[PDB]
Amino acid sequence: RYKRQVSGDEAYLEAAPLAELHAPAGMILPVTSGDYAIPVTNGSGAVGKALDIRPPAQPLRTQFTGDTASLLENGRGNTLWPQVVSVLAQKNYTITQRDDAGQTLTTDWVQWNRLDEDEQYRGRYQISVKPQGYQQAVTVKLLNLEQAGKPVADAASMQRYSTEMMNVISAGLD
Amino acid sequence: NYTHVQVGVDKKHELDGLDLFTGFTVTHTDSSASADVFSGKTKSVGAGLYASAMFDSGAYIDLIGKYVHHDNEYTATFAGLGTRDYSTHSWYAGAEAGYRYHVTEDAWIEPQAELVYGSVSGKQFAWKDQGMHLSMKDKDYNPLIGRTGVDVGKSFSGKDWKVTARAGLGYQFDLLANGETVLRDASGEKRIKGEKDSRMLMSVGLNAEIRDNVRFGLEFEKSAFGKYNVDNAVNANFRYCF
Amino acid sequence: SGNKSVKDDMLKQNLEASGVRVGESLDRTTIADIEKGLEDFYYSVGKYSASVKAVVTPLPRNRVDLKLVFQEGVSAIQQINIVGNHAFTTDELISHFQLRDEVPWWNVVGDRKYQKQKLAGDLETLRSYYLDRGYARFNIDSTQVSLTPDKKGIYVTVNITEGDQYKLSGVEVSGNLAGHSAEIEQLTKIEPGELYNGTKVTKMEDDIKKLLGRYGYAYPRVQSMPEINDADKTVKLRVNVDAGNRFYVRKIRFEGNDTSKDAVLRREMRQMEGAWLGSDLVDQGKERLNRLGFFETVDTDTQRVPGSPDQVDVVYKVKERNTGCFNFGIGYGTESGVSFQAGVQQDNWLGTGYAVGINGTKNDYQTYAELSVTNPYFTVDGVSLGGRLFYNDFQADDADLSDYTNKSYGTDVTLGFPINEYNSLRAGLGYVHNSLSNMQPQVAMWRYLYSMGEHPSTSDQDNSFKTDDFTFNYGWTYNKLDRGYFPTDGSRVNLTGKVTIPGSDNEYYKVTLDTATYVPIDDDHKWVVLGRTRWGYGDGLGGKEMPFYENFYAGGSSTVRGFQSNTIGPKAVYFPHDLCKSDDAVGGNAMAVASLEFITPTPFISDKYANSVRTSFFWDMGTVWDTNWDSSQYSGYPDYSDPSNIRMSAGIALQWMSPLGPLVFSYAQPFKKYDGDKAEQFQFNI
Amino acid sequence: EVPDNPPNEIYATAQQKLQDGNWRQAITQLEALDNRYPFGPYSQQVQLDLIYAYYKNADLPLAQAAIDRFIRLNPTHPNIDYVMYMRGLTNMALDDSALQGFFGVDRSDRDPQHARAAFSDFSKLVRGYPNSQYTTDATKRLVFLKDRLAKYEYSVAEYYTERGAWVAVVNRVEGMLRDYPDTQATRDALPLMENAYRQMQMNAQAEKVAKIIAANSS
Amino acid sequence: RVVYRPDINQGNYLTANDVSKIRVGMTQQQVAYALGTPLMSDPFGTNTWFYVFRQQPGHEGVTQQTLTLTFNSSGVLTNIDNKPA
């Protein structure tokens, strides 16, 4: 595929897991140097080709705290909601399912981001609420379940990209 | 059948939208020809200089010119030639202009033309070995030849294609054929000269490579026996090291 | 822009190292610092008409770009004098200085620029010249450079003190040295009545260090003071050497070999891991690694462990070179039918140390193939093993002209073992079948057939014969070189002799010798003379004659050059169908070729590629002849049993080690030519 | 050769054509963009894409230089696990891949260097941030590299056993078992230690290590 | 046999003069200074010290004279063991 995968030298997976060396009574093995030591470590991680190698998207007070995109300090912050309406449909054939005008409270619809990489239609839902914490009216978009090719997935990489597409749209246009 | 090898050096620099270039070179062409009553072994070794310029507008102008010393040992029975060594100098220079316009992103369309003028001393010798005088000599031959050729070149890269695929066709016609020679006989004497030619051409086969350690070669040949029983020579090889 | 004396590269690393490089901030203090520094560098070059100028160009997004203007007009050396001296002429001193004031017309050897470090080295040379000749009471009182009031001429003067001569009365040795003192005094045995020489003393400390390293002490400490008796006009040396500490190699380590395994290199290196280090052993090991020939560069490094006081580890940093290759090619053609060729020749297959050679070529004119495999280290001691199979049913049938059709094949197995530090004997057995057919009528071959008891007719051009041969062969290769390709030191001689055991159709024997030696003239080993020679002789036994096909040939690359590939030798004579002299040769039973060669680096390409290439002048001296020659038969035709008909030439040669492989290119001109020279001028052997 | 136009479009085109996989043209665009936009709003993302391109374009040394530039540029970034894993992957990829890979030749007794460096890098990663997404495959790589280094040392000890220098073998295998006590290499190297002790006339220790085999008969 | 055999040395060599310098009841640093660092050491249980002689010019009889030291876990020599063949 040559697109999103590590080199094909993946035969290292089927290596013999290490086994400890018993010390008989009457003598002791020399103390381990410990320079080449591995501790016990968790699992539940994709390995081989299933493991993902793509640069995580660095978000643009350019908020980057993962599941949140709370950027912020404009006196006309309330006017950003009609700007978001202009972004939807008009600018990019999008729509907010239930968006009040003054409240700036919206719920995103299942979209379809076909940005190559064999990434099929990705349905990302979110809640568009504009807070004013520690600054003026801030932008925030708490994403929700995404579909992509699979029925559902919750890998933080694809979730990060899914929130970051809206993040970069908002940052670029405003 | 012949083998010709040339080498040389060149110096160049850019300009305000132009890339001037010049250089010097030497060449050597050995050949062996077989006929019904004539068998010749010829060697033309010499040297010369060339120039080549191009721009960002898709136009290139090139020219070469060299002098060699053609010496040939020929065994012939008719006219009592025996085994004779005809040796003389020959200086010839040609020019050409091409326009490798960007046909697409994977090829460039190049129409080009060329014209060359060359002069060589004749073969003056006596045929007294045949019993009769039969003086054989030629005037100062000053042949010239033009040619027009179109081609398309695949500018492949990426170390996966990295080839120089090219296609097209070209026609060469003699611009001047002034090879006059004089022969003598008991009944009378005769004079001869040359005429025009309408030679065709072909393209190169593969000229392939991938990286800085692989080079692949393959040549395409044509043998148009219908016109003048012409033929060509081709080869195919590649080089790699561990 | 502006600079031309120095390539712009060293300028950009000069900027980069100082602290300013693309992408970081700007500091105008560093602007002034680097301006003055580049002026100082130009003054060191000697270009005092230099003024580096900085052009600041502001750019949006708070950027800046710096341009440099370099208006260097012209530099100057115009005067050297040695005022103060009285016993030596100035010119003989000038003959040794690196820096020269002026050089005469009929040579372009030296330039005329001024480099301060060159002056310092020249002062060192002058000091050594005076001190090693006895003048111990010598120094450099004062040296002055001077500039004319035009910034176009620089002079240099030196002021010294001659002093007086002194004699080496005697030396001694002190300090806690090794228990082997006797040989130290042996090496420091000084015979009186000889004048002083400082460089002699320096060599004394150096080789004392070498010898103590040989015993096993790797970090010694040696110094010496010349107690000078001015009243008696003599000197004595007081030397102090410490024993150091017995050092030991904890680990031996290799680094750089991507392809070759650990075992192949560890198999070398007479210096052993886990013992008392010997610098001589390490040098022998590094020379052997250089000898293997498939390492473009190897260098040794010694590093004591930061732990115990006496434990040192040695690393061998290498950079392998690509050797061996496989080739493939089809030569289709109406005049040639269908032709085909393939084959791989690799000195070190995949790095395992084995050597392999395979080829196969097919056409209507020829059908040839061969296989060859060898391991140099059958056992751990170094005995070799090799096998070779070949098939040569060429059948040059078309036109049946000036040849003789043969189908031949053979298999041989050899083994060889090393006997001393630099010699390996070789023995082996072989079997070979040959079958000759068609032939062509010409003289000097029928003698071989008649020697076997059969007398075929001479008018006919048909017929055939078969032969099987069992052979015992042996060899002896004395090799001592510095590297594996175009070396700079040593010599190598090769002996190969073959005989036939009872029960074989052929009855003969064969001997060949080769000798290539290299003699440098410069200590740095850049200009060197080269001596090649090949010798060969063989013949039949028991009243019989040696086979014609196995005979010697001469002419081509690596042989006498310029003449033709395989041209030197007596030419046959054809039977009537009276006797017609052949153009080509058939091969004499005794050949001897010699060559002397003068190597010189090419002055065009830079030092990045300099190690790769090598050009030279050469003088080919060769001659081949056949002792067996019936002079009485055709004395009317010239007699070539006498080897006096020498063939020789001279010219230039060039060798290029491309990533695609070895390349050779030679130009030569025959001088003592004869008939059938078919001379060429250039060759492109690989 | 490059359009000097506002940055939004050049970033957009850069990500779009990296999304295509046109590395030969993407590396030049990205490097020019970085050198002309040194402190853009999200230049970190630019540097990470440069890492990705360099690795996938097989220009490993310049990628290593970019890694050790980024680490000092901001030693505290919420994505340094990816950078460290990419560095270790670069080391391992640089280490072992050649015609032997087609031939399946055991690359054990080759020059380690890069293997040791890769092991150190991966170990630093895993001991740094066990909660990251690049730990499992990392741990597997640690196991594989440990096995490789142990096999290399076993091979050199085996050659010394072949020669007959029955001291250096003791030191090398002792270092093996002190460093690599939990691998197959020591498991088949112990008999070499036994043989060395038996040949060394100091069998008082020999049977001692023989008892070691008595604990792992299996 | 007949093939050339390179010289092999695989130990720490010390002459009889340093052997005479050995005496029970003194620290470890002094004995390391006197005989050199130990190229061998037992890493199991007792921290005893070994010194060995390997010397064979090639196709010739090997020469071995081992010399062993025992140390308690206090930094003082307990006993020695010389052996000349």
CA distance C664 to chain B (A): 14
* The token pair that represents C502 in the structure block: 């009872």
Task: Compute the distance between CA of residue C53 and CA of residue C39 in angstroms, rounded to an integer.
Answer: 10
Q: Is D184 on the interface with C (CB under 8 A)?
A: no
Residues, chain C, total? 686
Q: What is the DSSP string of C169-238?
A: EEE--BSS--TTHHHHHHHT---SS-B--HHHHHHHHHHHHHHHHHHTB-S--EEEEEEEETTTTEEEEE
CA dihedral D33, D36, D40, D46 (to 10 degrees): 30
* The token pair that represents C158 in the structure block: 């030196």
D-chain residues within 8 Å CB-CB of E68?
202
Contact across the interface for A30 and E45, Cβ inside 8 Å: no
Q: Is C262 on the interface with D (CB under 8 A)?
A: yes
Task: Compute the distance between CA of residue A167 and CA of residue D43 in angstroms, rounded to an integer.
Answer: 16
CATH number at residue E71: 3.30.1450.10
- Give backbone dihedrals phi and psi of D6, rounded to 5 degrees, phi first: -50, 155
CA distance C247 to chain E (A): 9
Q: HEC profile for C573-623? A: EECCCCCEEEEEECCCCEEEEEEEEEEECCCCCCCCCCCCCEEEEEEEEEE
Contact across the interface for D105 and C23, Cβ inside 8 Å: no
Q: Is E37 on the interface with C (CB under 8 A)?
A: yes
Pick from A26, E40, C313: which is nearest to D173 by CA?
E40
- Give backbone dihedrals phi and psi of B159, rounded to 5 degrees, phi first: 70, -5
* The token pair that represents B1 in the structure block: 């059948």
The three-point CA angle C72-C74-C80 to 5° equals 135
A-chain residues within 8 Å CB-CB of D103?
none
- B45 CA to centre of own chain: 14
Going by their DSSP bridges, the two strands C249-255 and C312-319 should be labelled as parallel
Q: Is C335 on the interface with B (CB under 8 A)?
A: yes
**Chains in contact with chain C (at least 3 beta-carbon pairs closer than 8 A):** B, D, E
Residues, chain D, total? 218
Contact across the interface for D99 and B242, Cβ inside 8 Å: yes
Count of H-run helices and E-run strands, chain A: 2, 3
**At least 3 CB pairs under 8 A between chains A and B:** no
**Alpha helix (H) residue ranges in A74-155:** 80-86
Contact across the interface for D162 and C380, Cβ inside 8 Å: yes
Q: Reduced to 3 states, what is the DSSP secondary structure of residue C570?
A: coil
Identify the burial level of A154 via C-beta atoms within 10 angstroms of its C-beta, where 0-12 means exposed, 13-18 middle and 19 or more buried: exposed
Task: Compute the distance between CA of residue C393 and CA of residue D158 in angstroms, rounded to an integer.
Answer: 47
Pick from D123, D111, D108: which is nearest to D189 by CA?
D108
**At least 3 CB pairs under 8 A between chains E and B:** no
The three-point CA angle C514-C518-C519 to 5° equals 140
Task: Compute the distance between CA of residue A83 and CA of residue A139 in angstroms, rounded to an integer.
Answer: 12
Of E5, E8, E36, the CB nearest to C310: E36
Task: Compute the distance between CA of residue B69 and CA of residue C388 in angstroms, rounded to an integer.
Answer: 47
Residue E58 lies in a domain: yes
In what helix (H) or strand (E) does residue D51 lie, and over which residues does it extend?
helix D43-56
Q: Are the beta carbons of C672 and C647 closer than 8 angstroms?
A: yes
Question: What is the chain E residue with the closest CA to A32?
Answer: E43
Pick from C517, C544, C511, C516: which is nearest to C628 by CA?
C544
CA distance E16 to chain C (A): 13
Q: Which amino acid is at B144?
A: L
Q: Is D165 on the interface with C (CB under 8 A)?
A: yes
Task: Compute the distance between CA of residue D137 and CA of residue D144 in angstroms, rounded to an integer.
Answer: 10
* The token pair that represents B118 in the structure block: 């060359």
Q: Of C248, C266, C383, which to mutate for an interface test with E (greatest number of E Cβ within 10 Å)?
A: C248
Contact across the interface for C381 and E5, Cβ inside 8 Å: yes
Domain that residue E38 falls in: 8-83
Q: Reduced to 3 states, what is the DSSP secondary structure of residue E78?
A: strand
Of E42, E43, E52, the CB nearest to D167: E52
Going by their DSSP bridges, the two strands C464-481 and C385-392 should be labelled as unpaired
> What's the DSSP call for residue A169?
H
Q: How many domains does chain E have?
A: 1
* The token pair that represents B226 in the structure block: 């219908």
Task: Compute the distance between CA of residue D78 and CA of residue D80 in angstroms, rounded to an integer.
Answer: 6
Task: Compute the distance between CA of residue D80 and CA of residue D77 in angstroms, rounded to an integer.
Answer: 6
Question: What is the chain B residue with the closest CA to D99?
Answer: B242
Residue E1 lies in a domain: no
Contact across the interface for E4 and C274, Cβ inside 8 Å: no
CA distance A66 to chain E (A): 52
**Chains in contact with chain A (at least 3 beta-carbon pairs closer than 8 A):** D, E
Question: What is the chain A residue with the closest CA to D124?
Answer: A38
In what helix (H) or strand (E) does residue D193 lie, and over which residues does it extend?
helix D184-199
Q: Which residues of C517-536 are buried (b: 16+ CB within 10 A; e: fewer)?
A: bbebeeeeeeebebebbbeb
The three-point CA angle C267-C268-C270 to 5° equals 115
* The token pair that represents C178 in the structure block: 């090794």
CA B96 → CA B19, B49, B65, distances in Å? 16, 15, 12
Task: Compute the distance between CA of residue B67 and CA of residue C539 in angstroms, rounded to an integer.
Answer: 51
Contact across the interface for D167 and E43, Cβ inside 8 Å: no
A-chain residues within 8 Å CB-CB of D51?
55
Question: What is the chain D residue with the closest CA to C258?
Answer: D111
CATH architecture of D1-218: Alpha Horseshoe (1.25)
Q: Are the beta carbons of C296 and C232 closer than 8 angstroms?
A: no
Those residues with Cβ within 8 angstroms of residue C442's Cβ, 6 or more apart along the chain or in another chain: C572, C573, C574, C575, C582
* The token pair that represents C215 in the structure block: 């015993």
Contact across the interface for D101 and A6, Cβ inside 8 Å: no
> What's the DSSP call for residue D87?
H
Q: Which amino acid is at C568?
A: I
The three-point CA angle B207-B212-B217 to 5° equals 20
- Residue C572: how many other CB atoms lie within 10 Å: 21
Residue E69 lies in a domain: yes
Task: Compute the distance between CA of residue C635 and CA of residue C478 in angstroms, rounded to an integer.
Answer: 43
Q: What is the DSSP string of C107-170?
A: ---------HHHHHHHHHHHHHHHHTTT--S--EEEEEEEE-TTSS-EEEEEEE------EEEE
Task: Compute the distance between CA of residue B72 and CA of residue B43 in angstroms, rounded to an integer.
Answer: 6
* The token pair that represents A1 in the structure block: 């595929």
Residue E2 lies in a domain: no
Q: Are the beta carbons of E18 and E35 closer than 8 angstroms?
A: yes
**Alpha helix (H) residue ranges in A62-114:** 80-86
Task: Compute the distance between CA of residue B56 and CA of residue C436 in angstroms, rounded to an integer.
Answer: 66
Q: Is C327 on the interface with B (CB under 8 A)?
A: yes
Question: What is the chain C residue with the closest CA to B26?
Answer: C682
A-chain residues within 8 Å CB-CB of E44?
27-30
Q: Is the dihedral of CA C391, C397, C403, C405 positive or negative?
A: positive
Those residues with Cβ within 8 angstroms of residue C382's Cβ, 6 or more apart along the chain or in another chain: C376, C417, C418, C424, E3, E4
Of E40, E44, E83, the CB nearest to D167: E40
**Resolution in angstroms, to 1 decimal, for this deposition?**
5.2
* Bridge partners, C55 (sequence order): C67
- D49 CA to centre of own chain: 21
**E-strand stretches of C541-579:** 571-574
- D23 CA to centre of own chain: 24
Residue E16 lies in a domain: yes
* The token pair that represents A166 in the structure block: 């809206």
C-chain residues within 8 Å CB-CB of B5?
682, 684
Question: What is the chain A residue with the closest CA to D186?
Answer: A21
Task: Compute the distance between CA of residue C33 and CA of residue C17 in angstroms, rounded to an integer.
Answer: 13
**Alpha helix (H) residue ranges in chain A:** 80-86, 156-173
- Give backbone dihedrals phi and psi of A14, rounded to 5 degrees, phi first: -85, 50
B-D Cβ pairs (cutoff 8 Å, strict): 3
Contact across the interface for E3 and C248, Cβ inside 8 Å: no
Going by their DSSP bridges, the two strands C52-59 and B236-241 should be labelled as unpaired
Q: Are the beta carbons of C79 and C101 closer than 8 angstroms?
A: yes
Q: Of D161, D198, D202, which to mutate for an interface test with E (greatest number of E Cβ within 10 Å)?
A: D202
C-chain residues within 8 Å CB-CB of D103?
350
Residue spans per domain, chain D: 1-218
CA atoms within 13 A on the CB side of A69: 27
CA distance E13 to chain D (A): 13
Task: Compute the distance between CA of residue B217 and CA of residue B207 in angstroms, rounded to an integer.
Answer: 5
Q: Are the beta carbons of C408 and C433 closer than 8 angstroms?
A: yes
Q: Is A40 on the interface with D (CB under 8 A)?
A: no
Q: Is C333 on the interface with B (CB under 8 A)?
A: yes
Q: Are the beta carbons of B226 and B202 closer than 8 angstroms?
A: no
Q: Are the beta carbons of B97 and B110 closer than 8 angstroms?
A: no
Contact across the interface for C257 and D110, Cβ inside 8 Å: yes
CA distance E10 to chain C (A): 5
D-chain residues within 8 Å CB-CB of C23?
35, 38
* The token pair that represents C343 in the structure block: 């084959």
Q: Are the beta carbons of B200 and B169 closer than 8 angstroms?
A: yes
Q: Reduced to 3 states, what is the DSSP secondary structure of residue C649?
A: strand
C-chain residues within 8 Å CB-CB of E31?
none
Q: Which amino acid is at C630?
A: D
Q: Is the dihedral of CA C447, C451, C455, C456 positive or negative?
A: negative
Task: Compute the distance between CA of residue C683 and CA of residue C627 in angstroms, rounded to an integer.
Answer: 31
D-chain residues within 8 Å CB-CB of B157?
24
Q: Which residue is associated with the tokens 């061996």?
A: C324
**Chains in contact with chain E (at least 3 beta-carbon pairs closer than 8 A):** A, C, D
Q: Which amino acid is at D128?
A: G
Pick from D126, D145, D144: which is nearest to D134 by CA?
D126
- Residue C455: how many other CB atoms lie within 10 Å: 9
> What's the DSSP call for residue D96?
S
> What's the DSSP call for residue C684?
-
Q: Is D102 on the interface with C (CB under 8 A)?
A: no
Q: Are the beta carbons of D101 and A9 closer than 8 angstroms?
A: yes
* The token pair that represents A150 in the structure block: 């699979």
Q: Which residues of B192-215 are buried (b: 16+ CB within 10 A; e: fewer)?
A: eeeeeeeeeebbbbebbbeeeeeb
